[PDB]
Amino acid sequence: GSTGEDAHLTQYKPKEPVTTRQVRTIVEEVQDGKVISSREQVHQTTR
């Protein structure tokens, strides 16, 4: 009987009892994936 196969990430978000940083507000924006219109490209199914 062959063994199974899977994957996982060893890294994880550390949960501290108290954070020094106030973290009043956060941001997350990049140039990539801007999506100006996404109409120039043409896609269709194999049918």
Short mmCIF file of N, CA, C and O in Angstrom, two decimals:
data_model
loop_
_atom_site.label_atom_id
_atom_site.label_comp_id
_atom_site.label_asym_id
_atom_site.label_seq_id
_atom_site.Cartn_x
_atom_site.Cartn_y
_atom_site.Cartn_z
N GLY A 1 0.83 -1.24 0.00
CA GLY A 1 0.00 0.00 0.00
C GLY A 1 0.84 1.26 0.00
O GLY A 1 1.56 1.53 0.96
N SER A 2 0.76 2.03 -1.08
CA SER A 2 1.51 3.27 -1.21
C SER A 2 1.03 4.31 -0.20
O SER A 2 -0.15 4.36 0.13
N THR A 3 1.96 5.13 0.28
CA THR A 3 1.63 6.17 1.25
C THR A 3 0.98 7.37 0.57
O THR A 3 1.05 7.52 -0.65
N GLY A 4 0.35 8.23 1.37
CA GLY A 4 -0.31 9.41 0.84
C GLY A 4 0.66 10.54 0.57
O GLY A 4 1.85 10.43 0.85
N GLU A 5 0.14 11.64 0.02
CA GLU A 5 0.97 12.81 -0.30
C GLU A 5 0.23 14.09 0.08
O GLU A 5 -0.95 14.26 -0.24
N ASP A 6 0.94 15.00 0.75
CA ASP A 6 0.36 16.27 1.18
C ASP A 6 1.44 17.34 1.30
O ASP A 6 2.62 17.08 1.07
N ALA A 7 1.02 18.55 1.66
CA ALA A 7 1.94 19.68 1.82
C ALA A 7 1.43 20.66 2.86
O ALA A 7 0.23 20.77 3.09
N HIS A 8 2.36 21.38 3.49
CA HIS A 8 2.01 22.36 4.51
C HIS A 8 3.10 23.41 4.66
O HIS A 8 4.23 23.22 4.20
N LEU A 9 2.77 24.53 5.31
CA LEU A 9 3.71 25.62 5.53
C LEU A 9 4.20 25.63 6.98
O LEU A 9 3.40 25.73 7.91
N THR A 10 5.51 25.54 7.16
CA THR A 10 6.11 25.53 8.49
C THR A 10 5.98 26.90 9.17
O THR A 10 5.90 26.99 10.40
N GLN A 11 5.96 27.96 8.37
CA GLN A 11 5.84 29.32 8.89
C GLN A 11 4.39 29.64 9.24
O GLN A 11 3.46 29.19 8.57
N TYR A 12 4.21 30.43 10.30
CA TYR A 12 2.87 30.82 10.75
C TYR A 12 2.91 32.17 11.47
O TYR A 12 3.97 32.61 11.92
N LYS A 13 1.75 32.81 11.58
CA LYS A 13 1.64 34.10 12.25
C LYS A 13 1.84 33.95 13.76
O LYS A 13 1.07 33.22 14.41
N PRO A 14 2.85 34.61 14.37
CA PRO A 14 3.07 34.51 15.81
C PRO A 14 2.02 35.29 16.59
O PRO A 14 1.75 36.45 16.27
N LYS A 15 1.43 34.66 17.60
CA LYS A 15 0.41 35.30 18.41
C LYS A 15 0.99 35.71 19.76
O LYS A 15 1.16 34.88 20.66
N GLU A 16 1.30 37.00 19.89
CA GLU A 16 1.87 37.53 21.13
C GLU A 16 0.77 38.02 22.08
O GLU A 16 -0.29 38.46 21.62
N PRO A 17 0.99 37.96 23.41
CA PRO A 17 -0.01 38.40 24.39
C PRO A 17 -0.27 39.91 24.33
O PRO A 17 -1.34 40.38 24.72
N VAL A 18 0.72 40.66 23.85
CA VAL A 18 0.60 42.10 23.74
C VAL A 18 1.52 42.59 22.63
O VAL A 18 2.65 42.11 22.49
N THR A 19 1.05 43.55 21.84
CA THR A 19 1.84 44.09 20.74
C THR A 19 2.26 45.53 21.05
O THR A 19 1.44 46.37 21.41
N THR A 20 3.56 45.80 20.92
CA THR A 20 4.11 47.13 21.18
C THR A 20 3.51 48.16 20.22
O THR A 20 3.12 49.26 20.63
N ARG A 21 3.43 47.80 18.94
CA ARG A 21 2.89 48.68 17.92
C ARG A 21 1.38 48.86 18.12
O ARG A 21 0.65 47.88 18.30
N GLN A 22 0.93 50.11 18.09
CA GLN A 22 -0.49 50.42 18.27
C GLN A 22 -1.33 49.82 17.14
O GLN A 22 -2.42 49.30 17.37
N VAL A 23 -0.81 49.91 15.91
CA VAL A 23 -1.51 49.38 14.74
C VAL A 23 -2.85 50.10 14.53
O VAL A 23 -3.90 49.47 14.37
N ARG A 24 -2.80 51.43 14.53
CA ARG A 24 -4.00 52.25 14.35
C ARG A 24 -4.63 52.00 12.98
O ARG A 24 -5.85 51.89 12.86
N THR A 25 -3.79 51.91 11.97
CA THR A 25 -4.23 51.68 10.60
C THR A 25 -3.18 50.93 9.80
O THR A 25 -1.98 51.04 10.07
N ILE A 26 -3.63 50.17 8.80
CA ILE A 26 -2.73 49.39 7.94
C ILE A 26 -3.06 49.61 6.47
O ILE A 26 -4.17 50.00 6.12
N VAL A 27 -2.08 49.34 5.60
CA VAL A 27 -2.26 49.49 4.16
C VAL A 27 -1.76 48.27 3.40
O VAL A 27 -0.94 47.50 3.91
N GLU A 28 -2.25 48.09 2.18
CA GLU A 28 -1.86 46.96 1.34
C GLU A 28 -2.28 47.22 -0.10
O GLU A 28 -3.42 46.93 -0.47
N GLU A 29 -1.37 47.75 -0.89
CA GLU A 29 -1.65 48.05 -2.29
C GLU A 29 -0.39 47.97 -3.14
O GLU A 29 0.66 48.48 -2.75
N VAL A 30 -0.49 47.31 -4.29
CA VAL A 30 0.64 47.16 -5.21
C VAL A 30 0.25 47.51 -6.64
O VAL A 30 -0.93 47.48 -6.99
N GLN A 31 1.24 47.84 -7.46
CA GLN A 31 1.00 48.21 -8.85
C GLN A 31 0.43 47.03 -9.64
O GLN A 31 -0.46 47.20 -10.48
N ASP A 32 0.94 45.85 -9.36
CA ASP A 32 0.50 44.63 -10.02
C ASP A 32 -0.95 44.31 -9.67
O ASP A 32 -1.40 44.55 -8.55
N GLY A 33 -1.69 43.78 -10.65
CA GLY A 33 -3.08 43.43 -10.43
C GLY A 33 -3.99 44.65 -10.32
O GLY A 33 -5.04 44.59 -9.69
N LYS A 34 -3.56 45.77 -10.91
CA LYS A 34 -4.34 47.01 -10.87
C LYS A 34 -5.70 46.83 -11.56
O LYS A 34 -6.72 47.29 -11.06
N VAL A 35 -5.69 46.17 -12.72
CA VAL A 35 -6.91 45.93 -13.49
C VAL A 35 -7.52 47.25 -13.96
O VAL A 35 -8.48 47.75 -13.38
N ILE A 36 -6.95 47.81 -15.02
CA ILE A 36 -7.42 49.08 -15.58
C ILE A 36 -8.85 48.92 -16.12
O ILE A 36 -9.72 49.76 -15.86
N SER A 37 -9.08 47.85 -16.88
CA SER A 37 -10.40 47.59 -17.46
C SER A 37 -10.64 46.09 -17.63
O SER A 37 -11.76 45.61 -17.44
N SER A 38 -9.59 45.35 -17.98
CA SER A 38 -9.68 43.90 -18.17
C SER A 38 -10.68 43.55 -19.27
O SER A 38 -11.40 42.55 -19.18
N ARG A 39 -10.71 44.37 -20.32
CA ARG A 39 -11.62 44.15 -21.46
C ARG A 39 -10.84 43.94 -22.76
O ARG A 39 -11.38 43.39 -23.72
N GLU A 40 -9.58 44.37 -22.78
CA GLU A 40 -8.74 44.22 -23.96
C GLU A 40 -8.50 42.76 -24.30
O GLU A 40 -8.51 42.37 -25.47
N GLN A 41 -8.30 41.95 -23.27
CA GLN A 41 -8.06 40.52 -23.45
C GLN A 41 -9.34 39.80 -23.84
O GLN A 41 -10.44 40.17 -23.41
N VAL A 42 -9.20 38.76 -24.67
CA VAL A 42 -10.35 37.97 -25.13
C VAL A 42 -10.17 36.50 -24.74
O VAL A 42 -9.14 35.90 -25.02
N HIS A 43 -11.18 35.94 -24.07
CA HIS A 43 -11.15 34.55 -23.64
C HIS A 43 -12.45 33.84 -23.99
O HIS A 43 -13.52 34.45 -24.00
N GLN A 44 -12.35 32.54 -24.29
CA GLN A 44 -13.51 31.74 -24.64
C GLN A 44 -13.30 30.27 -24.29
O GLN A 44 -12.16 29.82 -24.15
N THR A 45 -14.40 29.54 -24.14
CA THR A 45 -14.33 28.12 -23.80
C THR A 45 -13.99 27.28 -25.03
O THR A 45 -14.09 27.75 -26.16
N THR A 46 -13.58 26.03 -24.79
CA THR A 46 -13.22 25.12 -25.87
C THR A 46 -14.44 24.72 -26.70
O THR A 46 -14.33 24.44 -27.89
N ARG A 47 -15.62 24.69 -26.06
CA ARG A 47 -16.86 24.32 -26.73
C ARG A 47 -16.80 22.90 -27.28
O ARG A 47 -15.91 22.13 -26.84
#
